[PDB]
Amino acid sequence: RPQDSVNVDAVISKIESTFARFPHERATMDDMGLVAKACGCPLYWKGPLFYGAGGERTGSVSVHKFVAMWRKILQNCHDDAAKFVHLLMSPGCNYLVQEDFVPFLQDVVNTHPGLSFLKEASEFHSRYITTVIQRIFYAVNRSWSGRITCAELRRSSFLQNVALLEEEADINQLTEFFSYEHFYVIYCKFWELDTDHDLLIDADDLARHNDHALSTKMIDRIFSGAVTRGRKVQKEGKISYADFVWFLISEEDKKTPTSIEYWFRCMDLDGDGALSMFELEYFYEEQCRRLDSMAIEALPFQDCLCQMLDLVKPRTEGKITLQDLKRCKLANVFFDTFFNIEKYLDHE
Ligand SMILES: [Ca+2]
Ligand SMILES: [Ca+2]
């Protein structure tokens, strides 16, 4: 059998032929896989399609409601990225926020063969879901706006991964977003720190994570609001599991575009988009003191600065920009120099 036509009338006709198979021409969630195929969508769009047509409100979706919606989508959305954003977005918002992904991911948990074991343990559903969503925004939401647009989604590999869910029974093969194994490792590291089990960790806890390799001034910036995704205004002195995920991923690889932005935001004390000499010295100050505790005589700030200027080659004298750090391709060295002491554990 040859491929289906792509045009509007043909697609609508195919949808109608599919709904004609349903009692009362209303689709339940169990029918939505067939509906996804009629739409030329990957299987795991079934949840988004159902919720998109308000299925959660009445328990089913009539052909008339679904067709009217899909007509609109085909009029407004030329590609998969546009269609996906349209399905998940809140009315009034031309973008996706973290919470928009929850029903989709819950359906993935409820139905994907690779998560069957997890499905019967709803205790950890939300934490798995939270983890996947963090990894999605970490990779996709390059503007740090908290709002994923069609353009951002289009530039990512996210939808490719969604399409692959139906092809891979072992979800752990899909390492970028959905991997349960990646979630497990991340969660267990959080668990080690959260010793009183209140699902929050403080600065003392966070310092333990890599054996006090990060300076206390940098640890304090993690708690400042500079990188929090939770939009909280007050300095609460504790961070959530969700924010820990962002820290862990950033700390383990300081070379990725998102991670460079993460550490840049922390160093950018006044949040003006440039690292001033005051800001660099503020951090390097503590590095020297820590190095002293290890019988290492640190370079004076101006000597260290010579080497960093040569490493980074910033465009404008007197400041280091995010663009400078990305272009030098050695931002991890820059960051480590200013706030990371790998073998600080061995200090005497
Ligand atoms: Ca705790
Ligand atoms: Ca600044």
Pick the closest to residue 190 from 124, 138, 103, 136 (CA basis). 124
Instruction: Find out whether 336 is annotated in a ligand binding site.
Output: no
Is residue 266 within 8 A of residue 250, CB to CB? The reply is no
Is residue 243 within 8 A of residue 203, CB to CB? The reply is no
Gap from CA of 98 to ligand 1 centroid (Å): 24
Is residue 38 within 8 A of residue 18, CB to CB? The reply is yes
Give residue 53's identity as a one-letter amino acid code: A
Domain extents in the chain: 1-88, 90-177, 178-348
Experimental method of this PDB entry: X-ray
Domains 90-177 and 178-348 share a fold: yes
Is residue 64 within 8 A of residue 20, CB to CB? The reply is no
Gap from CA of 321 to ligand 2 centroid (Å): 9
Is residue 138 within 8 A of residue 130, CB to CB? The reply is no
CA distance 327 to 331: 9
- Bridge partners of 321, per DSSP, are 274
Gap from CA of 131 to ligand 1 centroid (Å): 18
State how beta strands 200-201 and 61-62 pair: unpaired
Gap from CA of 237 to ligand 1 centroid (Å): 11
CA distance 219 to 260: 16
- Bridge partners of 340, per DSSP, are 214
Contacts 24+ apart (CB under 8 A), 17-20: 19/62, 19/63, 19/66, 19/67, 20/63
* Cβ neighbours of 10 (radius 10 Å): 11
- CB-count burial class (<10 Å; 0-12, 13-18, 19+) for 204: exposed
CATH topology of domain 90-177: Recoverin; domain 1 (1.10.238)
Gap from CA of 285 to ligand 2 centroid (Å): 17
Gap from CA of 335 to ligand 2 centroid (Å): 15
CA distance 326 to 28: 49
The number of the ligand nearest the C-alpha atom of 197 reads 1
Instruction: Find out whether 270 is annotated in a ligand binding site.
Output: yes
Instruction: Find out whether 9 is annotated in a ligand binding site.
Output: no
The three-state DSSP-derived secondary structure of the chain is CCCCCCCHHHHHHHHHHHHCCCHHHEECHHHHHHHHHHCCCCHHHHHHHHHHCCHHHHCCEEHHHHHHHHHHHHHHCCCHHHHHHHHHCCCCCCCECHHHHHHHHHHHHHHCHHHHHHHCCHHHHHHHHHHHHHHHHHHHCCCCCCCECHHHHHCCCHHHHHHHCCCCCCHHHCCCCCCHHHHHHHHHHHHHHCCCCCCEECHHHHHHCCCCCECHHHHHHHCCCCCCCCCCCCCCCCEEHHHHHHHHHHHHCCCCHHHHHHHHHHHCCCCCCEEEHHHHHHHHHHHHHHHHCCCCCCCCHHHHHHHHHHHHCCCCCCEEEHHHHHHHCCHHHHHHHHHECCCHHHCC
The number of the ligand nearest the C-alpha atom of 196 reads 1
Sign of the dihedral defined by the CA atoms of residues 289, 345, 239, 264, in that order: positive
Phi, psi of 315 (to 5 degrees): -75, -35
- CB-count burial class (<10 Å; 0-12, 13-18, 19+) for 235: exposed
Gap from CA of 319 to ligand 2 centroid (Å): 8
What is the residue whose two structure tokens read 């940098």?
A: 218
Tell me which architecture the domain covering 178-348 has in CATH: Orthogonal Bundle (1.10)
* Cβ neighbours of 144 (radius 10 Å): 13
Tokens at residue 34, please?
């067939």
Phi, psi of 253 (to 5 degrees): -145, 100
Pick the closest to residue 161 from 231, 80, 79, 215 (CA basis). 80
Helices 125-140, 180-193: inter-axial angle, 10-degree rounding: 110
Gap from CA of 326 to ligand 2 centroid (Å): 17
CA distance 209 to 14: 55
- Residues 6+ away with beta carbon under 8 Å from 348: 294, 295
- For the chain, give the longest Cα–Cα distance: 80
State how beta strands 61-62 and 274-276 pair: unpaired
Instruction: Find out whether 236 is annotated in a ligand binding site.
Output: no
- Bridge partners of 96, per DSSP, are 148
CATH topology of domain 1-88: Recoverin; domain 1 (1.10.238)
- Residues 6+ away with beta carbon under 8 Å from 184: none
CA distance 303 to 286: 16
CA distance 308 to 293: 23
